[PDB]
Each structure stands twice: as C-alpha cells, then as structure tokens.
Amino acid sequence: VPKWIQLNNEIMIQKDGKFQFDKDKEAVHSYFVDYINQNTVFFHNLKEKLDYLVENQYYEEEFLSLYSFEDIKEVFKTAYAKKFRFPSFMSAFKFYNDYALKTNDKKKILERYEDRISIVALFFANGDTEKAKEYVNLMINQEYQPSTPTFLNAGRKRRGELVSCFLLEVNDSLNDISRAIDISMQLSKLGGGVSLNLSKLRAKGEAIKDVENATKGVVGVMKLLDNAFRYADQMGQRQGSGAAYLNIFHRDINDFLDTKKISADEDVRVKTLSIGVVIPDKFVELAREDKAAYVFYPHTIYKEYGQHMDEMDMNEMYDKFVDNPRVKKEKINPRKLLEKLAMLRSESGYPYIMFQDNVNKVHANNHISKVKFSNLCSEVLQASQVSSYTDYDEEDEIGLDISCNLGSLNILNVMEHKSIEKTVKLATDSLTHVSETTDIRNAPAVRRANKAMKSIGLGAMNLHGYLAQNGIAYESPEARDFANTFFMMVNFYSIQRSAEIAKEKGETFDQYEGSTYATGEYFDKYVSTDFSPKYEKIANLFEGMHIPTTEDWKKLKAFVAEHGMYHSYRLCIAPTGSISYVQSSTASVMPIMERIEERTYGNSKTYYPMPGLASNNWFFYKEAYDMDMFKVVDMIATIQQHIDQGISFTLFLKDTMTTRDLNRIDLYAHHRGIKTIYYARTK
Amino acid sequence: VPKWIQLNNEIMIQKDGKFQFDKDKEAVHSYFVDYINQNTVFFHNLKEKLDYLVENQYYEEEFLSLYSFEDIKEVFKTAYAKKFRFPSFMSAFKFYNDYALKTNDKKKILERYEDRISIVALFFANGDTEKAKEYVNLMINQEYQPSTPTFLNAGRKRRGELVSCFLLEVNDSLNDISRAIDISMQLSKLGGGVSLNLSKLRAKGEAIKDVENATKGVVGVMKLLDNAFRYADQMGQRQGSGAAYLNIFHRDINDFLDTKKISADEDVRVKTLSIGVVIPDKFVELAREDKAAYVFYPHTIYKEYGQHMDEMDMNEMYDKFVDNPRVKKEKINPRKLLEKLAMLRSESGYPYIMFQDNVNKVHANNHISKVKFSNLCSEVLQASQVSSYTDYDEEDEIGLDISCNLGSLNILNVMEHKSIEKTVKLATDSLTHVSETTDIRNAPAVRRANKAMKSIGLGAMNLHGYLAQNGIAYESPEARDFANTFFMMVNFYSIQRSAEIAKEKGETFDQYEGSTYATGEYFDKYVSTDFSPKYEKIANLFEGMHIPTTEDWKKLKAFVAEHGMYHSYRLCIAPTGSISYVQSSTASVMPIMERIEERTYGNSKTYYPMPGLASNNWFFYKEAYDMDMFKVVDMIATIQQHIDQGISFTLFLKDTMTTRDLNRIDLYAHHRGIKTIYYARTK
Amino acid sequence: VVLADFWAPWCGPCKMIAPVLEELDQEMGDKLKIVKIDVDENQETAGKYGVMSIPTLLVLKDGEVVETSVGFKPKEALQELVNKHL
Amino acid sequence: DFTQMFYNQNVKQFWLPEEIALNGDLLTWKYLGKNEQDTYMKVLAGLTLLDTEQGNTGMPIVAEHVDGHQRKAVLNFMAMMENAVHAKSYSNIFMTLAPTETINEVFEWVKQNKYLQKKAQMIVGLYKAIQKDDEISLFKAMVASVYLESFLFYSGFYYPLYFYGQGKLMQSGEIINLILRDEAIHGVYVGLLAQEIYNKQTEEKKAELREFAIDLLNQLYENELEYTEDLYDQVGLSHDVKKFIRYNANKALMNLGFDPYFEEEDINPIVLNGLKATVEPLKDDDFYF
Amino acid sequence: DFTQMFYNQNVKQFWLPEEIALNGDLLTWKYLGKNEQDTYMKVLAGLTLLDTEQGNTGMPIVAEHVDGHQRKAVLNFMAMMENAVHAKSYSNIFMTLAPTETINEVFEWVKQNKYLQKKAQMIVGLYKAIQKDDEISLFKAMVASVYLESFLFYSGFYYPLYFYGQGKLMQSGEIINLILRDEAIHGVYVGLLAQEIYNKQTEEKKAELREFAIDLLNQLYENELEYTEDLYDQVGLSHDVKKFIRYNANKALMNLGFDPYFEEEDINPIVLNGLKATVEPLKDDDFYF
Ligand SMILES: [Mg+2]
Ligand SMILES: [Mg+2]
Ligand SMILES: [Mn+2]
Ligand SMILES: [Mn+2]
Ligand SMILES: [Mn+2]
Ligand SMILES: [Mn+2]
C-alpha cells in the first residue's frame, strides 16, 4: 500500500471522535512527493517540452502556431504563478489518472495541471495571448471548468471530438434508420454520447408499402442501436453509451419500457441503450382525471395529417386523433403507465422523464421546432428538425441534430472571487470557440445544426458545496433564494455575452428572428420580476457584485433586440461526473450523495470527503437521500427558471419509499416546472 | 380432413405390398375439383381479368402496355393450349400456396399456372409476341423454370426484386461497415439473400489509428449484420437470411467458427447469419504436410503491402507474410482447424466451404478480380471489387458487388423435348432481360456490377429424376458421362447465346478483353477434349440432338473472339428449393434426400413421392444419405468442369460416420476440383 | 427351388440375415439354391419383382415367384417358408 | 440424455413463499364481487387439494419405482417443492385473503364437490395401482401424473392468471405463476420418463398404451367441462376457460410424445398477459487419393 | 412443539455445491501422498453410498409412515438434501480432483467392499422392514437412521475435517462442513420422532427397544472398526478415527434419549479446529399540490 493511500485511509480513523479530514491534505503531498513528481517528465525549458509534445504527435501544431513562443511561455508562467495545489488527494488522483497527458506507454506524466490548463487556454484564445492569460486565470482559479471532452482533448492530436452530447432525429424509414445507426456509430467513435428520438418511427404492427403487420416497431430499432453502441465503444476504452427517447403517446411505449425490465428476454432487453420517455401535459391530465388514454400508431397519424405525431401539439391534437377513425390507437390506463414508469425507475433508474410542455412553454425557439427529446444525460433541450435521408445517388434533406457544448461554472470559486460576469462571459467565449472549431464529417445534421444554431451549454457545479461551506442547508429557502439570484445573474451575463458576440460578428443564430429573444417575450419575467435576494444572508453573499435589476434586464432586452443573440441556447447543467473531482467540487447542482465516498481503485481503497467538509459544516453537508425530494425539486425548478435548456436532475430515493412516492415526486416536478428527470438512484 | 389430403395419404397405405403412387394423381384432381376451381376467380374474358389485375395494383401496367390485347390473348391461349396438368398433388399445392397470385385478403386465387406463366413470358419478351409465345412454350413444357423471385414477382406491382442472391464486399472501415449493414437491410427488404465478405475487416486486437487492441474483429460486425438481418426480415414473412464469408487465414477464423458452436455465449453466438469459410490451396497443403500454419492480421498486411490479405494469392505470399516481422500472425494447427470445420458441419451444417484455388484456377475473370467468397447458397462465384464508402460529403469509390439472376433447366423435360440448345438460349435471353430490368437504388456496387458484369445464373434441376427415370444409377459412371455431355452442351449453347447477344447489342461485359474468353484460354479443354458420351446408353439418350464436337467448339471460340461475350458469368446451379416442387423435379443436381417425403402443412400431413417414382425405378431413386459421398463428389466435379460459377453442393452424411469421414469427403472434393460445399446434412 | 435375397451393403437387417442364409445353405443347400442380389447395383431386377424394401426374400420355383417374405427372418421361419415348395 | 439438464433447471428455479409479501393483495381483494371471491376461493382450494395428493403420493410413488440414482434425486427435489414450497404457498394465500372459519368452510365444500373428487380420485387410483417391477402400471401412473401437472391444474390456474393479467391480486398471482412454472417442468420431466417406458414396448402394446392415454384424457376432459361450468358460469368465463383446458391438454399429450387431440385455438389475451458426431483425428493419407 | 422450527432451520440452510468453487483445492490435493489421496477418495465414496441410500430409501420411507403434513414436509426436504445435494457434492469434489479412471475405480470399490456392503445391508434392511401402522418397525428404522446420521458418517467426515483443520483442501472441506451441519439437525429431528414412539411403550417394551438399539449400535460399531482400520492404517490414523466414532456414537445415543455408552477420550485437536420495490396505486390527491 502506497504512503498517500495510507494517509487517505487515515481519514476514517477517528481522533477525539472526529474524522481526520486534514490528513487528506497530507496525502496529496505524499501523492506528489512519492508518485507524481517521480513519474512526471521534466524538460530543460518549455520550448523543449512543446517541441517534444508536438513532434511525438501529442499536441496539434495549428493552435500552438498562432502564438509566438514568448506568448506561450507567458501563458504557462501565468498558469504556474498561481502555485495551485490540489486540496484533496482524489482531485489530483482523478486529474492525473483521467486528464493528465501520458506517454504512449502510459507510465510517465507529460502534463501537469498547469500545463493542461495552459494548453486548453491557448486553444480557447485562438491566437490572443491576453485572452489566453484570461482563460488561464479563469481555470487556475477553478472558476470555470471545460467539460471532460474539452478539458481532456483540447490541443491534443490523438483526441476525440470536444462535443460528447449528440441528439439525433430518426425519420420513419429504413434509409433513415440505417443512417441513424451509422451516425450513432460515428459519434460513439468520436467519444460522444448519442441520443436518438424514436417517436417518429412507426410502431409494431404497422404497414410497410401497404402490407399489414410488417413493422417491428421501435424495439427492433433499439436492438440495432444497442448493437451499434456496443460495437462502437471508443476503440475498446469505455462502454458505448446511447439513449433512446420515445413519446409516451407512442404505441410502442410499453414495449419500449419493457426493454428495461429484468424479466425481459434476450431479444427484448437492450443493455447499453438508455431509454427516456417524453411525457406531454396531455398524458398528465389524462392520468390526473383517471380517464383512459390512447397510444397512437404514428404512421397512421402521418398518413392522415401529413405530419409526425411528435411534430404536433398533443394537447390540441389528442381529441382529434381519438375521434379520427383513420388513426389507429390502443386503449391504455395512464395511471398504470405512470406506476410502470415509477416501478422501472425503482428497479433500474430508467426511463428518463421529459415533461414536454414544461420544456416548450419556456422554449425560446419553438418556431424552429418544439423540443421533442433530450440527451443521454437528460439536460440538453433544443429544437431539432428531422432529416430525410433518401436512397443512394439522391440528395438528402439535412435537418438539425442537436449537439451542444458543455462547460461548468464552479459556483463556490466564482462567487468567492465575485466574478460571475467575467467567468460567465469567458466561459461563453470558450464554448463559442469550441463550437466553431467542431467539424463532424459523418453527421450532416449535427454539423449543420452546430453551424446554424451555435448552441452551447454553460452549466454550474459546487452548488451544494458552496451552500454547505456558507452555512446554508440545500433544502432551505435561503438556498433557493441564492440559486435564483445566482442563476439569474448567470442567465443575464450569458445573454449579454451572446448579444455582444452577435454584435461583434454581425450574425445571430439561424432563425433567430422568430425566437422569443427577438420578440422580447423571453425577457418578460425579467422586466417585471425582481430577482434580487430576499434574504439578508444571500445579499451579503452577493456583496461586491452588481445584481442585475429590472432596468438592467430592460437594457439587455433592448440590446438583444438591436443586435440579436449569437447562441440559440446558452445554459444547460450537465451532471459533471469526473471534472467535479479535479475541481474539488460537488457534482452539478445536485445535493451530495455521501459526505465521504469510498472507492476501490485496483486493489486499494480510497476515501473522498466532500469539499470543505468539516465538523462545523458536517450537518450542512446533508446527504441527498436524507433530503426531502420535494425541496430538491423546488431548488431545481428555481434554477430551471433561469436555464434555457434542462438540468440533469437525479432523484435520490430511499429503499423504504414506494413507487407512489416516486410518482408523487415526478408529478410535483411536473407541477413545479421541472423539464427533465434524470435518474432514480435508490440507496 | 380434405378429400385430396386423404387421397395423398392413401399413397403410403400399401396395396399388395406396393405403394399406391397413382392415388397421388387422384389427389391432384380432388385438389382441383374441390379447392382450386372453387377458390379461383373467373372473369368473362381475359380483358376483364387483366383490367382488374391492373387497376387493383396487382400487375404493373408498363410491361402489359407493350403488347396489344390481341397479342396477350394469343399468349394466354398458347399457355392454355398445352392443357398442362400437375402430375402430383404437392406440385399444384406448392404453386398455389407459394407462387399463385391471390387477393389482398388471400381468400381467392387470381392466377392459375397458365396465367402466371403467361405473365412471366410477357414480362420476359418485352414487347415481342413471338418471343412471349416461345417463353410460354418453354415454361408450360416445364423445360425452363425462372427462379422463385423471378417466377413469383415478374409483372407484379407489389413485387420485390427478381434477383435471388446478393454478394457484398465489406472494406475495413467503420463507414464501409455501416454502409454494408445498410445495404444488407435494403437487400433483405427487397427479399434477396445477402452474402458479405468479412475477410478484409481487420481481426480482433488490431489498431484503429495507433491505439492498439481496439478492434472487435469480424465477430462484432457479424453481430451487427445478424441484428440487421433480423430487423429486415421481408416484412415479417420470411426470416432474414444472411451469409458471412471469412478466409481461413484470417486471425478471427476460430472466433468466426465459434459463432456457430452450440455452446457459444450469447455475446458471440450468431443465429440468423450463415457462415462460410474460404480455404486456399495453401491451407490444404499445410494441413496435408501437418506443418503448423499461421493466421494473419489483415490490417498489418494492408499496412505493409498496401493490399488486403484476400486481395492477393496466399499460395505465393504466405511465406512472405510469415517471414515478415511487420506482419502480425498467430500460430494454428491446420489439421485441428480442419477437424473443427468438420465438427461444426456435423453439429450445424456450417460453415460453407469455398475452395478458393479450385474456383480461381478455372475462373475466367481473374483479371477483374479473384473470387474471394460465395453467396448464401455457395454457388455464385464471381469477381468482386471492394467499394470505398467514404465520409459524408465525400465521393465514394463504388466497386463491384456480385449479383446474378437464377434460372434452372429441367433436365428431364429438356432432354425429353430434345431441346438443349433452344431452352438454353431462351433461358439466357430471359436471364439477360431480368438483369437488364433490375435497378437497385440503394446498393450502388450491386447496381454497377449488374450493369457492367451482366452476370446471370443458369442452373439445372431434375438430374437425379432424369437418371432414375431412365434406369441410370446416380453414382454410376454412366450418370457422370451423361452429366458431362449434357452440361458441356449447356455451356456450349450458353456461350453461343452470350456471344450472339454481344453481337446483336454490339457490347460485351466490362473488362471482357482481359478475360479467358477473349484470349481463347477458356476453350482450351473444349478444343482438345471430346465430351461426347462414352456409353451407348447415354448416346442413345442424346439422340436427335447435335452434340458439339471439338470443331463446333473451335467455331464457337472464333465467334467469341470476333464478337465477345455479353455475360461475364452464365451458369450457376442453385439449390432450387421450393420451385422444384412445381416443376415435378428433384432439387438441383443433388441426389434425392428421400424417395417419399412427409411434410406437415397446417394440422395435416402430406407425402410427396419423388417425380416418376414407381416399382421399376425404386432402387434407381437411391437416397442421398445411402450414397457414397465420393461418387457424388465425382458427379459434382464432372458437372462443375462445365459450370463457370459454382454448384450448391450439399453433403449428405450418416450419423454413424465420424468427423474424419467428413474431412475426407471435403479433401476429396478439394482434390476433385469442387469449388464450394454447401451443407453437411446428417440423417 | 431358389431363395432369392434382395439386399444392400448399407441395410442393417440385410447384414443380420447373411449368417442365417449361410447356415440355411449348409443344412438345405442340396435341395435349395440361395441367390443374393445387391439392389444398389441391380435396380432392374429389383424393379421387375416390385421390391420396395430390403431384405426381401423371394421363393422361386422353376422361375416363378411362389412366396415373398419381407424383413428379417430367423432360420426356422425360412426353413418353414422353403419346405412348403420342395 | 436429459436428467442432469432437468436437475439444473429444477434447482435453479428454487424459491420460498416468504419471498413474496402477500398483504398488498387486500387492496384489490376488497373490490371483487361475491361471485369473484367465491370462485377464487373454490379454485384455490381445488389446486391445493390436488397438489397435496401430488406431494404425498404422486411424486414419491414415482420416485420409488423409477430406477436410476440421478432420476430419484430429481424426483425427490420435485416432491420437496410440492410439500415444502407449494403447499405452504397455497396456505399463505388462503390465510391472507380469508378468515380461519371461511377457509375451513371452503375446504369442506370443495372436499365434498363431485367434479373435484372425481378427478382427484381417478388420479390417486392410478398411483395406488402401480405394482413393483411392472413398467406398464408405472407408465399409466406417469400418464396420470403428467395429466395432473400439465392439464388438470389449468382449469384452476386460469383465474389467478386472469386477475394477474388485469393488475388484480398481483402478489398471489406472482406466487401462482412460480408454482405453475414448477408444474410445467414437472410435467415435461415425468413425460420423458413415460416415453422411455413407452419406447421399450412392442407395436401392439404401444397402440394399447395410446388407447389408455386417450381414453383417460377423454374421461378427465369431460369432467373438466362440468367442473368448469360449475365454477365459472357465475363469473361468465367458462367459454374461454374451456379453450385454455384444451390448449393445455395438447401440451400434456406432447409431453407424452403424442399428437395433439384438439384443434388449435387462441387464448384469452388477459390470461396470456398473466402467463455431436464422433471426433476422429485425421490420420494422414486422407489428403491423398 | 418442534417441527416448525426444524422446517425453518432446514429451508434456511439450503445450499448447492456449485456455490463453492473447488479449483482452489487443486494444489493441496496434488501435494498429498498416494496413500492419503486413496484414503480420501474412498472415505468420500463411502459417504456417497450412505447419502444415496438415505436419499433414495431412508428419508422417503420414514416420510411415508410419519403422520402430519408439516412433519412430512421436513422429512421430504431432508430426503432431497441427501440425494440431490449431499450425494451430488461428492461427485463435484471427485470431478475436480481426480481423473475419470480413478473415479470409476472408487465406485467399483464401494460395490465390492465388504464393510460398506454390510452396513448398507443392515441399514436399508431395517428401512424396508417398516410395516404400515406398525410403530415398532418404524422406531427400529428411525434408530437405524439416527445411527447413519450421527454415527456412521463420522468415520468418513474425520478425514476432510482433519485436512480442513490444517488449512488443506479447504474448499472441499467447506462442502463437508455444510453436509455435517445438515446431518447434525437431521439426526436430532429423527431422534425426536423415535423418542415419541419409544415414550408410548410399556416399561417392558422400552427395555426391549433399548436392547435393540444397543445391540444394533454394537453390531454397526464392530463393523465400523474394521472399515476404519481398512481405510486409515495406510495413513496412520486408525486409532484417532476410532476415538472420533465413539464420541459420535454417544451423540447418536443422546439424540435417541439414551445415556452415553463409550467413555470420553481426547479427540485430535486438528479435527476440532476442522469444526423490485413496493408498489402503491396513485390516488387522485397525488396529482394536486
Ligand atoms: Mg418510407
Ligand atoms: Mg480506415
Ligand atoms: Mn405443486
Ligand atoms: Mn408438481
Ligand atoms: Mn446427507
Ligand atoms: Mn441426513
């Protein structure tokens, strides 16, 4: 057992009835005195290091060639001047095991934290030394963290794509299904998680070329996609991850759900394909009134109306579908379907829940399209247009496939530096740069939507960490007040940066004129409701920072009207799985699952306390499972009212509570305006 | 139970110790006087029938519009003038259950045998009334039988494709793999059996852009193809059938074979995809000498030499592969691999065995490409060039994917009418028409190969029926002499018709100039060896017909040199599974499996005696399992010497014999020049 | 009086009757001729006598078939069958 | 050829009554009509009574007369499931749904019932008639056993499966489904043991055993029709139950290697929702000809 | 007063040999002398024979004659354990450690070994002598069964325990400990049933039954001595094993409610060291907040 591992396991050993949290710091020192420095490749000067990394195909020449060597050296010196130290052993371990650049033989460390941060900053700035230094200060202060794809791959020649969330629309044809399989394979090859909308696909027992009972339904397509994702597994590094979304009014919805039951046969169950269910308000109304619902055959609806079932508003179309004899449907019990969803989520955490009307009543780009489905993490909520992939030697009709750009603000580090505006604007600029530098040659709709929509996702993390280190309970009204104010400022500065970029470049996102930003509707609640903190403690937390008022929001609305907005979407809160370790932060805006987490690496045990955990804030670091899920829903809705896209919202359940409690949490989330529900993790 | 069912079951009720074969005839009468005539739809005249079939989307109006109604009436009258009667109940039952056109609800019969034959003939003639009458006389005499796709679908609006089998070359890339999956689904949707050569795909544990041990090998692509064929299953009517072919020198050859082991795990087992193994002469030489062989990693060979492993001759490059340090290889025991092949064929009948050198030593189009794999029935052996399917927005390099149209001569009816020449020429014309009117819009390589190669497959059926009905034992040397003479005549007249078509159209198949037809090498054995019958009985059988001599073959060689050949490939002997019932013929050139076959339809059971089975020819109708497989191999080699493509050669084995006997049969087949071995069916 | 055995090399019951016919020839071979015909090599004779299974034993007297026995028979049953026609 | 495979399948299907919590059934039980509750009770008692005969006599008597250590072990395992698992499971369902006095009365009624008694005593009669070293009498008892496992239980199983397919009485329906899954494999296994005896018989003896099996099936079937009307007419289900009986009779016949007796019929969709060649090495000179 | 608690204990002790991976014993087995391996194989083969007959014959026959569905369920479960679990586990051990020829030879050796045949003859004879409704013949068979469970197995159990206690053959030893844990409760249970019958008798009859039990024990004991010497002399342990079997004979007597018969002795200390989520429906009030 290595010395740092012993020093880390000494945390659980209680002295005077208290955990030895400070020992973790010592572990970090050991982890750097015994391992990191010994296995870190050192060069006589930075010029030799850069030459070795470029020549050995570690880095890219293009992004480094935009700067003189003096500017690169100055950026590296700015990164190293902070003298950044990892506060916990797990932060350094996760960085140097997951993100630090290693040799081809994987035995030596080529990149330190400062080296990786400097390289990512130089990639972000695209030739501006001052902008690169600003990015270096942003990331070495740990105010902003690029996503795992961006952070890991920026500036590296041997790399995947910087985007890992992809949403695909699948049209109801064999050509479109095969193209969707191909694109899913290509994007999994790039290292991205792929979400596919299967609602347009006709159900089982539908007609193909006027022959009856011919379609295999969406379950056969799910089997094909599951095989494709198993095959494309990042060159045998990570398990291929894919998601399938089906509308709850789709006929296959039961069989869809049956793919996640344990009792399902081998020809029914898909193991590497996550599933999500899109629930319009009509289904919730039918379940609430106990009226029996109808699941419709999509192809009959398409034949009768010329549009897909998921392309029209089910609230106004459901009665017409039911009363139409030419539309085929089956009777179902919506309450039984809700209970089945709750039972499946208790068993396996599936499916993801998308409340379609909750997403689309605040969607700014409904003119382009309504949000029909979400991503693999159930936080990307954007307009998508299906593509018509025709036969060979025939021109395809390329639509819009969602692919947003991830990046997370560290709420604790951002607010302690009193730099919400600067961090948000710099993160927006970096996300814009990564979106512009993304070029996928095997996903036509993804590339077209990236060029047109210019959608980015700016998330936040360390919300619970920040609240606990400031003596605020996650379920307290003060925590929700802080979340409201902080995320309203984040939205304000994100919109301001998007409008500034639109003014500078002279271009907005495609079809911006029809958006609620152009009409000023988006700013309505911002020009009438003041989002300043209602509690003195939160106001003192925001001291030293200008909180945008209603007049500031009116000025921003006028600025957006005059200049437009560069990004169709700006904010989405991703789970932030492993980057939260490196940043010494709690994951996403979720409450912490455990105060101290036990992990097993190799044959060794390791202990990670939550950041800033001590005896004084032990009570404020309440575990997520012990919390009231209604108050977690309230906090997530408070944040969601300032996020244009969704939030990865995982439910944290105890084994005692039943499926009725899960359904109640889901219905309260629907009532409170929650857009997506990610997972049902049972303790 | 129906009256005809009782009459058919009365065959096995022996009277005076003899089977009541004549009762079968009575059954047909019943089957027509109680079911067919009552379930048929009669019109006032042919005009009303044709109009009803055209407006109700049963028939394509284009092929019927090329004839005036008087000509169509004359063709139908010619079809009905023969007063064709089905001699057995099963012939009529199979036609009216599998090939006769029925209504949309399948409650009535719209097409008689004469109606179907007239429609097929009118489609074949393409506006020529005299040619349509010739086709009608050819099919109503049952001298020639179009394949099941062509016979069933000709002239139908709701038809599929007339091509039975498709062969795809899969290049070693994710884009090519996805395109192969798409094309396989598209062609299975069209109803055709798809065969894919997986020998170019790099083995398991190969590098995908400098990251090693990343590829899943051919087994992952096999699973993808298996799921694709499961999904595309002819709209749920016929199970999707696919074939995968791998060279025996591929490193994955064991894992390939492990897909068919009955103890294979679900993550490896493949159940809807047939497997075939391509064995060069080098492997047989290594197994014979007991020298340990080496299987190779295709990607290393491609990197070192710039060509695929199956793209070059292993007999001359195996030692270079072994001695090359930059080529990766694994040690295997070729005798153990042969024993594994024999065990697998005993257990499940797989893999198909393709003796590559036996195919390519007489292959006439080696300049275009060597034959690297076969079709789903292991009788199509044609040159194929792999396609380079590139990224989206990039032009694809379209190669040649094999596809030929099947048609079988009825040997008994052809020789009874003394019309080998006329039947062969008319069948060649019909297959040329089927190739010309075939246009597949989702398989580019298949379309290009169909347009360029112009390859057709002219098979033969009722070899054993003709031999047994003429008092010739199938294993006798007289039977092999008859096969030699008859198939030399078939080859002569097929080459003559191909050259005549090339002369009348002024065009040959693509790259004909480099073929052995153009150089005259193909005719060598035909201009030096006489293939006239060596037995007086066979010569008497061929009386009234001009058997071509060496002088006729020299004249044909000169004619081909002057005019060329329209078809790259002309003769291939398919299994002819279910259409042999309608023709009252034994399946293909294989010997009969059983004298009387008991088949269960619905809740009833029926007995089909072999055509012409009686007391005097009972022991001439020797069952295949009771026959010496070496003499069957001799027969198949004798036929194969006159067939440019392969023959679907099924091995018929007894349970008592061991895997060593199967290996001996395979090695004797390889020694005798057998190109492919289809199945190992054990009694 | 001739006992004609219609047999084949693959027929299991025909292998069982072979030693029975050898014992029968030792006991009765002065009054009975035993003839074996392979139906795999001699289909015309098997067809002429309407044989459709093996072993088939024909008792012939002066060229005419007087009795027919199908399947395996023990020696005593073959002796009884032949002794009727001696 | 089959005993070790069945051993594996049997032991991996092992379960205990305690695994399913029964109390939540009271939330749907209270909403059934009197006729529904009455039919359910009567069906349940019918299954209980028949299964007790199988545990006390049917399986142990067959285990006693069958030769082979491995077969005796599998048969012992099946007898254990009847007595230790199934019997306790039926008792648990009863105790959950009815008070003690109601259980005693239902069992008194079903114990006196003409159609239940007729079939119970017919089966038991054949078990009592097995004679030492007489494989014919053993075969007849095996036929009776297969008919119980694969056929006679199903007029009863229908109702719990019918509720289970509708979302009613889900806990007891889960238990019944596990029991039914055991009886299915019991029927298949005993069927294979019967076919082994059947295949050792002459052609005349086979025809005689077939006549026995069909005659027995006919007697039981005609009584099942009466049993069915007696229980299910009051809840309007008899027509569909009759289709289910015939479908399961055909399965029982197939278990005994016999042809189906009844034409194929579709089953109620609610009930449906509830429901090596010898390796010889190459010796060389096999490559030369 | 006891059957229910034995039922619960038996079913909670349920196990299968496949739960224990045996490849870990491969090396400590390889390292034993030929004499040690021979004795070990033969010892387990003797155990296999005893469990074969206890499962096929002893437990089922006692189950048949004992009244009460719960008592029968316990006895049926114990019978299943004997032949479906215990007897089979020995084959799992054999198939891991020994080549097929050695396995074939040891099973041939059980058939011809005179002490093993004698003990089987005596025990099975008493089982087959049980007469319906004759409690005395039943008592005699239960005494025989207790002697098999609590005495006769122990000449066999000694050796796996002796190795387990030295840290050798510990996976096989784990199986044996599970078997021993089962037999201990089987011996107690059957002992209690035997005492029930004994307690019904006159004092004169009781005196005769004690004579029967002691005469039978002595006869079995004398045979077991010869068996023990035959197996253990080649490994030098016969005297030690003899002390162990006397110790366990006293436990068998105690299970029958009798006083110990042999004097206490020190046993080898090595051998002593060898010893789904809950579902509620949605109410209309759960849709409003
Ligand atoms: Mg379409
Ligand atoms: Mg490539
Ligand atoms: Mn039972
Ligand atoms: Mn049972
Ligand atoms: Mn035991
Ligand atoms: Mn015991």
Side-chain angles (χ1 to χ4, degrees), chain A residues 119-176:
Chain A
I119 286 311
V120 177
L122 291 159
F123 171 78
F124 281 167
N126 210 30
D128 200 349
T129 172
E130 283 333 279
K131 190 85 165 189
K133 287 152 87 193
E134 293 180 41
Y135 282 124
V136 137
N137 284 321
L138 200 70
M139 311 204 249
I140 208 62
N141 292 343
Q142 288 203 141
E143 300 164 280
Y144 168 66
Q145 171 56 66
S147 64
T148 289
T150 310
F151 196 56
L152 167 84
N153 295 315
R156 292 197 192 168
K157 191 131 56 213
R158 216 291 314 151
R159 78 162 175 77
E161 258 300 338
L162 296 193
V163 182
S164 282
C165 71
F166 300 106
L167 287 80
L168 308 186
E169 295 260 353
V170 193
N171 216 334
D172 190 41
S173 92
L174 191 74
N175 280 331
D176 292 295

Side-chain angles (χ1 to χ4, degrees), chain D residues 51 54 59 82 86 149 153 182-183 186:
Chain D
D51 212 28
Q54 198 72 338
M59 281 299 174
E82 316 291 16
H86 296 177
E149 302 277 5
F153 280 143
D182 293 337
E183 318 299 24
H186 298 172

